[PDB]
Amino acid sequence: PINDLRSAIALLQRHPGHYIETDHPVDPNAELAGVYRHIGAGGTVKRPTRTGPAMMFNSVKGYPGSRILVGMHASRERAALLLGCVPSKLAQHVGQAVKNPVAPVVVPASQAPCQEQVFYADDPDFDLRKLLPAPTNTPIDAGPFFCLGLVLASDPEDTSLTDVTIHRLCVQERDELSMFLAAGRHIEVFRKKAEAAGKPLPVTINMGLDPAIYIGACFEAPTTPFGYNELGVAGALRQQPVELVQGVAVKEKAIARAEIIIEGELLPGVRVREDQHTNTGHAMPEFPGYCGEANPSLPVIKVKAVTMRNHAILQTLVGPGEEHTTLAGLPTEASIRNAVEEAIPGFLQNVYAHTAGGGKFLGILQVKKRQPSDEGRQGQAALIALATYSELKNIILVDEDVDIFDSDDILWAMTTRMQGDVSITTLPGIRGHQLDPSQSPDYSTSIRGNGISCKTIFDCTVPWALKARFERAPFMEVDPTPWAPELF
Amino acid sequence: NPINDLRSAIALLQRHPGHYIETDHPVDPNAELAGVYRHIGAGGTVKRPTRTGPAMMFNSVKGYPGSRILVGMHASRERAALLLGCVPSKLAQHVGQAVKNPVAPVVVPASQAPCQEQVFYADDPDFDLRKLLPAPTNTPIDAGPFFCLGLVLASDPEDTSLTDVTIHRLCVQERDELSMFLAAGRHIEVFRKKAEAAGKPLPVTINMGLDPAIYIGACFEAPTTPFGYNELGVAGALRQQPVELVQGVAVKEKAIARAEIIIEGELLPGVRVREDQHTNTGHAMPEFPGYCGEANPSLPVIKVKAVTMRNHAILQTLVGPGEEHTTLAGLPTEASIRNAVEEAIPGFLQNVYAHTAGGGKFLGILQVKKRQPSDEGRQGQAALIALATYSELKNIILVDEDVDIFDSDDILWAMTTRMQGDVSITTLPGIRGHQLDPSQSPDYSTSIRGNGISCKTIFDCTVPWALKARFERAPFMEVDPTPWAPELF
């Protein structure tokens, strides 16, 4: 079975094409990301690019004994393989585990591989910049970045309330990182509580994990006493609870079977400019495919210790490309699937949070009109999708005979099953997302501020009265394996 | 080493693994044949699952020992570019360059006509086209067995110096009869009217199994010269070797000397047939948009006089018509659109893709580069030129030079982050498009006055000139990734 990063790699090695290694040296500064751009970054990264194998870089220039791993989640086919289900049913699969979680468990340090090696910060030869090779994606980033930091944090007033989230961090000093916290998230509430009292907030950055943890943590989870409830998804996906170990130097727990763990605390009453040492004005590439701007006021994490297993694998991403599409798009598809199935049972067939929108901006809904009254319900499904995921932008509606994962087949529906003065409904002035650069008053007079957009529903479904005229050419059902065994 | 026929082209594909396979597993030419290749290489607008892949040779045909059927030869832009010696992105330019400097065909005696290694005359009472050629059916609801890549040669029955070569599809009707549609307004149709007026048939040759250069070049617009057969001049220019012609054996027309199979027949005047007379399925064939077409009620009949083929003749056709149609139709579409925009706006259009989702006809993708403030507003001009150039286009998408116009994911990305639905979308109602789009119906829109009329839409996904500094895609370091994974390159 799988219970950490390395056992997942073993499964990938039994399916050739999903994992490779290389011993040719590489620079973690921009060179690594530039290489994986051609191999497996995918997503919204500039062409040429493609989905490919997960990649391991064994020779890291300037970091002997370190190995960097990227693209673990940069493939919907790979992600379904890691959880054991069909790719088209992957969101439905994880959504089922969301509804029947398996709570994590605390285990002693003897069962925590993540603490085989310990490095305290108060040691005078400790330097976070020499201990870990944090890669940069572009030569214009704010600095070195960790992009897959599973952050654990508890309320300082009541430890029974926790939060499990994925963050990115920029290495600033030998013992400091900058970390943005989304306003409204529980951990940001926890941090403002501690900063209001002048106290730091202990946290753990857990990196190099079972893919089931990274994916499952992106879903919304209920709350239970001493919860860490986001981990319950991975517990249900593996039918084995996720094990936790007490931190070595902070009053917070950590993933026991993690590759690397940074223990630190959010400092009270201190901010930092994200690119203070590079002065590029930017932070790093964002999921829409453009370079985000450097945040001028970020809170600082003061590192206390770094614990890692022997021959620790540093896991991060590149792009963020298809990797971000997987981690954000599966929750997007799941919450839309639940909302529509609740409102219109048996109508929605599937949903794809398209990788062209990073799994956030573009939603493709596949419906099936079973009866005359289903005409008019496709627009209802699009309204439900927009209402469930406010950060969406455009919705495309197609029938069950369209493959929503094939963008050629989507454009085909836009071509032969659509009239621009009939099938296109615009919705101006709806709050969308700040990182879409076209959501600007400079782009449209109907946009009153940044992050507001026009939202468009493309109804490429066949009108119920005409479905007999739109049957695709019916080729005979055959098994092509005998005529070309090598292709199957 | 050079290419001058179908078999020399297959030899080139064998030197590039992935573009050609064979199978000895028996296959039924009725439906089963197309059903197999639908999974392997049909591509295009064929219903999923499908993809582009190798061209395929079926060496074992049920009930037809000694026959071998070939499909998918043009069912790939990469394969077509390799078959012509250029990169797939410049494929439309490479052919358009050869169109401007054609090499005229040359007539040769039967000594140099491999196509005439076998001859079957139709006056034999035991003659039967069904026993001779295993014409496949794409779907069980087709009007009948079909030939889909018949290169037809014909000449004016009055002024033989006026010639026309074209690509048609033919449905098998009798042991010696075929039904063949002709597009109104083309020379071979005008030739047939003159002949039918005088109560005289029109001699034609149906050339199948050709150099891909011939099939591809024949779809472009060619001039007219005395005894020219000018659409063949593109293939001659693409090979730097004139296409060889041979006088017919039973009819008054020449045939492709290097062809695999030749059907010599005549268009009988006065007689008409409906396509599905023997099947009554109401349909004819799967069309390029992806739906089954309706049977033609009145079709001119070709009465075959002789069938002519080389030893172990390969039967070439298509399936889908899928990506194979996209290649043959889209390359002319892109070329004429590119010529029109480069003339009107030099240096602006970077590339153009007759997207395979439109069958190479309905959807056009235009890649422009705004170089100066005056270029703002010219992107819509470029879309209007393409719409004016290819009236069967329905939608246009405009993208910048940093968008891969052949990557449908990348096209939807520009439509997601570089587009506002109430700013970037222009609808043009009431413009004639194409009859085979089923949404071009009054039942689909009150602004459509008749079949074949559509609303045409321009999606402007180009960054406004004033904002270009804010829409730079993330700049990843330029590297050569070969040393890190040589097995992938």
Author numbering:
A (entry chain B): 4 to 491
B (entry chain A): 3 to 491
Quote what the paper states about this structure:
Based on a literature survey and a preliminary activity screen of heterologously expressed potential para‐carboxylases, 3,4‐dihydroxybenzoic acid decarboxylases from Enterobacter cloacae (EcAroY) and Klebsiella pneumoniae (KpAroY, 89 % identical) were selected for further studies.2d, 13 Both enzymes belong to the UbiD family and are related to a ferulic acid decarboxylase (Fdc1), which has been shown to facilitate the (de)carboxylation of cinnamic acids in the presence of a recently discovered prenylated flavin (prFMN) cofactor. The AroY monomer consists of an N‐terminal prFMN‐binding domain (residues 1–339), an oligomerization domain (residues 340–475), and a C‐terminal α‐helix (residues 476–495). A comparison with the previously reported structures of the fungal Fdc1 and E. coli UbiD14 shows that AroY structures adopt an “open” conformation, where the position of the prFMN domain is more akin to that observed for UbiD, compared to the more closed conformation observed for Fdc1. Crystal structures and in vitro reconstitution data unambiguously demonstrate that prFMN is employed as a cofactor, and that oxidative maturation is required for activity.
